[PDB]
Design a protein around this ligand. Sequence first.
Ligand SMILES: *Cc1cc2c(cc1C)nc1c(=O)[nH]c(=O)nc-1n2C[C@H](O)[C@H](O)[C@H](O)COP(=O)(O)OP(=O)(O)OC[C@H]1O[C@@H](n2cnc3c(N)ncnc32)[C@H](O)[C@@H]1O
Ligand SMILES: O=C([O-])CC(=O)C(=O)O
Ligand SMILES: [K+]
Lengths: 611, 113
Amino acid sequence: QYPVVDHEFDAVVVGAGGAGLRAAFGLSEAGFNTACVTKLFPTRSHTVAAQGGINAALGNMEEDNWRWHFYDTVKGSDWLGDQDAIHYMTEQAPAAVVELENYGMPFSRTEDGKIYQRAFGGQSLKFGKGGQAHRCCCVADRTGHSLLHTLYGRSLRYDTSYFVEYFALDLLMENGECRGVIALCIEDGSIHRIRAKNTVVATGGYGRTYFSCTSAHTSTGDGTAMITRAGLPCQDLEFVQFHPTGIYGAGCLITEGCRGEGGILINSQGERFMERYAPVAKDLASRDVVSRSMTLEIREGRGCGPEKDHVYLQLHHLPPEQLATRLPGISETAMIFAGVDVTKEPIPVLPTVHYNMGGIPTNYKGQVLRHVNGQDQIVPGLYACGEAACASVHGANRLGANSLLDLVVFGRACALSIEESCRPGDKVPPIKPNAGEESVMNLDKLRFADGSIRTSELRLSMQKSMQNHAAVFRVGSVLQEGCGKISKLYGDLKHLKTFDRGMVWNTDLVETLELQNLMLCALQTIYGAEARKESRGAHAREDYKVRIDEYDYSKPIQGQQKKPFEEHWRKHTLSYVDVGTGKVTLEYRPVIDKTLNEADCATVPPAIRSY
Amino acid sequence: IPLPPWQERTDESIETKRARLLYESRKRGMLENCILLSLFAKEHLQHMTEKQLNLYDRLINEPSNDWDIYYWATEAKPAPEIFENEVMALLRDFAKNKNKEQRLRAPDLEYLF
Ligand SMILES: *Cc1cc2c(cc1C)nc1c(=O)[nH]c(=O)nc-1n2C[C@H](O)[C@H](O)[C@H](O)COP(=O)(O)OP(=O)(O)OC[C@H]1O[C@@H](n2cnc3c(N)ncnc32)[C@H](O)[C@@H]1O
Ligand SMILES: O=C([O-])CC(=O)C(=O)O
Ligand SMILES: [K+]
């Protein structure tokens, strides 16, 4: 019933974000016949929302060393990040930025023509001894767009074949090797098998598993679900990073500059509660302290609104000139989405999903990993980079301005590893004639569905359950009830009912495919959060408030008995899902503490998390 | 630097044009344009003539930066003369909520069937 168009390329890149465009442009510049599949126009990727900058120890302000950026990233990951990847990312950071500038990115420069660097919170010097660092290189406030505009423009110069508005359905796997991707043409509804010797998955995050995230409705974990349907593991999916101040309901990001310019957080009793939880830093404390404080205020009963589920962000005590000049765009955002005049009303705010540290496990070369009998093994022909991948350079918590760095470094790394292990025009591996039939069968079932639960109704129940069970507040009984609810919602996928039965721009069918991908990401996230009985980075439990490492790093290491692997939690989570039954399976692999070379960069041993 | 000069499509039917512009309105880069354009498409797409659909097509698909479209609709930055038309006026009117509607979540697609 469905004709299948076939395409042959040297390499296929799923995703036209910062990471996908860097990998596609790198493969095409190296001479490979490269296809780039994307359900959006490349400038419509979530990368365009990034208005900050990119971290790099260029030293164009003070004296800086990339090993200090290495130390800050390792410390920020709460020693769950792989130090060999953090070594590769931080060391390649200066060369990548200069390469981006020579590509044509209008980086904001200084008086002497050097790239200007700002001070994003969390950067230090001298291995954390002291001194704020200036590593954030920004292109005004359109760094994310300028990155997408430059890479997509240069990729077209090398004849990168773009499949704009194509929805990748599944990986084409055969005998444990990836031989391309089968995708859906959203315009006409034709199935296309884009065959290639190497596949690079750069599909972004999955923030839409929750009801309140700062990302667009497109971050649906599609690449994460493809890896899951392929029987391959996903890594650290419970580590969901929250931004403290997001508008209640919509989820739009409220910048920390509001609290910097004088904005305060208020509960349902007029109390500036941050004076109590952090008398030193107050409302400008660390994001984890602010988020858990807000969640604790809502739990104990001091929540605002008719449902008492959020707190207030007050700005009206500031003069109107400061609200307009020092905080541009905050008044328009609060009025348009919350119906709030900031000069006389507070902004309803709530902790909001912002970044996914987890995703597809890879090595520092971008090669996707699987776990076979307690050992890591490369999946031939499969690469991942960006927010969809778990290098892991961010470990348990991502630092600011390191995501755009993660995009360009490992997107380039994926291209380098493909061109160093293959050659353009190599023999395109063959696939069975009926390869992808399971994907087309699933697509046809969703199109001809007429059950009892609508797609929007199931999506709302999933997002609500994830918001009420696996968000900032995580405790045993709540997490376990959430696992049962999400598992019940996965069984209810067999009761879906869609309406658009055609194939011409079937947005209803696209969103129902994304709901399938969201449910797979939600199952692995909430089961991994229930199992991880510790507190590390963005994961904080009330029944287990201490970071459980192989040693107790609050005391001298030697003199203690090193806990075995099956007892401590300084280890990555590996999650599988039996798509037929929804059963989740959890494995674990160790954190890579060795660097690329100890002579050039020393391993930073774990230490107690200092807020 | 030069990207494909945006072309006005005249090969698709009016129903295919509305369906395409509905997809391109809901699937944006930022959450701000995701909520506004999806709710603006819910209220105007099925009633627009082909003239208005072609203006709405150019408004939401020609600008490379989604932030530029957002700043024009919120009147934070002056829109170009090629975009100052009737659809931009409706978008500015829709952005300045007068009936005090939701503007929180993207509308569910159950209003089309
Ligand atoms: C959400 C967000 C993130 C963000 C930020 C502000 C916001 C609102 N500001 C940042 C900042 O100032 N500095 C920084 O370092 N990071 C900042 N971030 C985070 C970071 O920028 C993002 O995580 C990053 O841009 C994500 O990059 P990535 O390329 O991995 O993800 P993407 O840009 O969303 O691209 C995904 C692409 O994949 C395509 N896709 C997805 N699913 C499919 C399917 N099924 N088929 C085909 N293509 C698919 C998308 O179309 C897109 O092109
Ligand atoms: O400034 C913000 O709110 C966004 C942010 O921390 C980042 O993504 O780097
Ligand atoms: K990630």
